[PDB]
């Protein structure tokens, strides 16, 4: 316990990664029909994201060293989120034909709202020396979610 125990931050990353990866597996396996289980995966992901905001609210700021140590796990999580979004977009045809396009749209709008809250929280923990890269990562994920929102809009 000499150093910081930044395990709170690592746990949030892992919890979100677990939710993303379950969604991703299910979206890749999906080849048509009822998509309720995908919406439910999305809602476990929203819960993980909002759990993060609450878990980390009262944490002290990250040092440069502490934040640097999280750059790897955060870039990995970005990569995973962006891939999951692409795999979702890839399944637009079966999803829309099954009558789930709107519902997916609506889930994505809730993902966007939750991601924005978590990004905002993160910006209150990162030291200035990592503020630009952290914002870049957050913007990438926001742009990915918007791509998904745009793909399912009007369906």
- 44 part of the interface to its own copies, by CB under 8 A: yes
Per-residue DSSP letter, 63: P
> What is the C-alpha separation between 37 and 121, in angstroms, rounded?
29
Under 8 Å between Cβ of 61 and 6? no
| Residue among 7 and 77 whose Cβ is closer to ligand ACD | 77
Nearest to 84 by CA among 39, 14, 149, 28: 28
- 10 part of the interface to its own copies, by CB under 8 A: no
- 13 part of the interface to ligand ACD, by CB under 6 A: yes
Site string for ligand ACD, 66-105 (x = CB under 6 A): -x--xx--xx-xx--x--xx--x---------------x-
> What is the C-alpha separation between 97 and 41, in angstroms, rounded?
20
- 43 part of the interface to its own copies, by CB under 8 A: yes
Interface segment toward its own copies; rule CB under 8 A; list 17-25, 27-35, 79-87, 134-142 = 134-142
């Amino acid at each position: 316990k000499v150093k910081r125990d930044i395990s709170a931050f690592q746990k949030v990353i892992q919890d979100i990664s677990l939710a993303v990866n379950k969604f991703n597996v299910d979206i890749e396996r999906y080849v048509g029909g009822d998509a309720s289980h995908l919406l439910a995966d999305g809602n476990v992901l929203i819960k993980a994201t909002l759990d993060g905001v609450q878990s980390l609210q009262n944490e002290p700021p990250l040092s440069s060293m502490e934040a640097l140590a999280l750059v790897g796990p955060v870039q990995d999580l970005s990569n995973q989120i962006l891939l999951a979004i692409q795999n979702l977009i890839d399944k637009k045809e079966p999803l829309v034909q099954a009558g789930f396009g709107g519902k997916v749209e609506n889930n994505l709008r809730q993902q966007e709202e939750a991601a924005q809250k978590l990004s905002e929280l993160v910006s209150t923990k990162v030291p200035h020396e990592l503020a630009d890269i952290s914002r870049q990562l957050s913007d990438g994920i926001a742009a990915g979610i918007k791509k998904g929102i745009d793909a399912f809009a009007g369906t």
